[PDB]
Write a protein that binds this ligand. Structure first.
Ligand SMILES: *CCC(=O)N1C[C@@H](n2nc(C#Cc3c(F)cc4c(ncn4C4CC4)c3F)c(C(N)=O)c2NC)C[C@@H]1COC
Length: 284
């Protein structure tokens, strides 16, 4: 693979050992791996990382897309609540892009597994998740970045229970079809993004509202049972999801504010961080 080497990011292949594919879906693209020297404090320690790689039969677009996503992560910079770029192997072999490893999977599965048992999460723990996703989104918005698909599936949880937004630098095709027919992204989409293909940081705020509903339903499916045809009618008429059973009134007003039809009437991510911060303080 003929590519330029960015020395400050280049990792030696001797330091990387590839492991098992992560997740059953899209297998082979993302694998678990160990990288020695990633932690500046412990040079000898192998650090578990996630490695994105191309398929054996990949197109030149697939390669350019992966390089562009890596390059956009370099521009955006690092934040605790986003999946960060750790390095890359671009010379003398196949392209490997290293990102932070999230042991506890995506937020939806993390919540569904912790609906019952000892690992069951408290109200404060669920508010902490919302605050961390809002913090990471505030940073991405400040760096001129629009996620376009903010949902629990695209938020990964570390072994230390840190929330990290994933695939933010990823370029997504606006529409698979008017009705995608894959037979779900439309439930998280704002009305302007869904009907007019308009994406702003305020459309991500609508998606954050749907994500907040996921958090307090512990990984619940938004608008359950409602077909896509009926969903378009319901949103145009002003109908919104009901308050999750284990959710406070003040938090449901934050959700209800994210779902204003007028984008500017929704709060900014700076304001959502501030609203979720006050919810964490009041509990004492
Ligand atoms: C196709 C794999 C997939 O959808 N999975 C597997 C599981 N999972 N994926 C991730 C990840 C990641 C990752 C990536 F590989 C590359 C990437 C990311 N941001 C940007 N970059 C591009 C290269 C520059 C990114 F988040 C993880 C992690 N990281 O722990 C896991 N853990 C499990 C689940 C997910 C969904 O499966 C249905």
């Amino acid at each position: 693979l003929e590519l330029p080497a960015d020395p400050k990011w280049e990792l030696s292949r001797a330091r990387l050992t590839l492991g098992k594919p992560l997740g059953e879906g899209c297998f082979g693209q993302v694998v678990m791996a160990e990288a020695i020297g990633i932690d500046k404090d412990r040079a000898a320690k192998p650090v578990t990382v996630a490695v994105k790689m191309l398929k054996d039969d990949a197109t030149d677009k697939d390669l350019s897309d992966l390089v562009s996503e890596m390059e956009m992560m370099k521009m955006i910079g690092k934040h605790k609540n986003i999946i960060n770029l750790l390095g890359a192997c671009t010379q003398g072999g196949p392209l490997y892009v290293l990102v932070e490893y999230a042991a506890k999977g995506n937020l939806r599965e993390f919540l569904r597994a912790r609906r019952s048992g000892e690992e069951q999460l408290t109200f404060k723990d669920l508010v902490s998740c919302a605050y961390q996703v809002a913090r990471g989104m505030e940073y991405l918005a400040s760096q001129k970045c629009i996620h376009r698909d903010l949902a629990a599936r695209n938020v990964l949880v570390t072994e230390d229970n840190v929330m990290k937004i994933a695939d933010f630098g990823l370029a997504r095709d606006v529409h698979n079809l008017d009705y995608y027919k894959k037979t779900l992204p439309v439930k998280w989409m704002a009305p302007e993004a869904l009907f007019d293909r308009v994406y702003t940081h305020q459309s991500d705020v609508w998606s954050f509202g749907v994500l907040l509903w996921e958090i307090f339903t512990l990984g619940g499916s938004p608008y359950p049972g409602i077909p896509v045809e009926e969903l378009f009618k319901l949103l145009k008429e002003g109908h919104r999801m009901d308050k999750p059973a284990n959710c406070t009134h003040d938090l449901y007003m934050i959700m209800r504010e994210c779902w204003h039809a007028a984008p500017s009437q929704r709060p900014t991510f700076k304001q959502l961080v501030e609203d979720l911060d006050r919810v964490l303080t009041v509990t004492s």
